[PDB]
Specification:
By secondary structure, the protein is an all-alpha fold. It contains five helices and no strands. It has one domain: Bromodomain-like (Histone Acetyltransferase, Chain A), CATH 1.20.920.10. The protein is globular, with a radius of gyration of 16 Å. The relative contact order is 0.16. It comes from Homo sapiens.
Length: 121
C-alpha cells in the first residue's frame, strides 16, 4: 500500500535522526569505553552480574536494521549502557566515571532529539 510506504519513509527518517543522535552520543565517549560489548572471554562472569548487556556497536546494528520504533526504545538501550556500567564498576573507577560523564553530556543531545521527534512527528 501507499500507507505502508509512507510509514516506511517515517521509520527511515527516524533512523536517519537516531543515527545522528547515536553519533553525537558516541562522541561523548572519546576513550571508547562503551564502543563494543564487554568481552565474555575477558570478563567471564559478566552475565552473572549484568542481565541485559549493551554497547554502541550493538545499538548501531539494531539501528541499521531499523529496529528502533521510537526514541523511547533507543533511549532504553542508551540507559542500559550507563546503568550496567554503574552497577558492575565501583564509583572510584575510570569506567564508572566515564558513564557518569556520558550520561551528563548525553542529556543535552537527548533533550533536543525528543523535541525534534515530537516536532517532525
Amino acid at each position: 500500500s501507499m500507507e505502508q510506504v509512507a510509514m516506511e519513509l517515517r521509520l527511515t527518517e527516524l533512523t536517519r535522526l537516531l543515527r545522528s543522535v547515536l553519533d553525537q552520543l558516541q562522541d561523548k565517549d572519546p576513550a571508547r569505553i562503551f564502543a563494543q560489548p564487554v568481552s565474555l572471554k575477558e570478563v567471564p562472569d559478566y552475565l552473572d552480574h549484568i542481565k541485559h548487556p549493551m554497547d554502541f556497536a550493538t545499538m548501531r546494528k539494531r539501528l541499521e536494521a531499523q529496529g528502533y520504533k521510537n526514541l523511547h526504545e533507543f533511549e532504553e538501550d542508551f540507559d542500559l549502557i550507563i546503568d550496567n556500567c554503574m552497577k558492575y564498576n565501583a564509583r572510584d573507577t575510570v569506567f564508572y566515571r566515564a558513564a557518569v560523564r556520558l550520561r551528563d553530556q548525553g542529556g543535552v543531545v537527548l533533550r533536543q532529539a525528543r523535541r525534534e521527534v515530537d516536532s517532525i512527528g
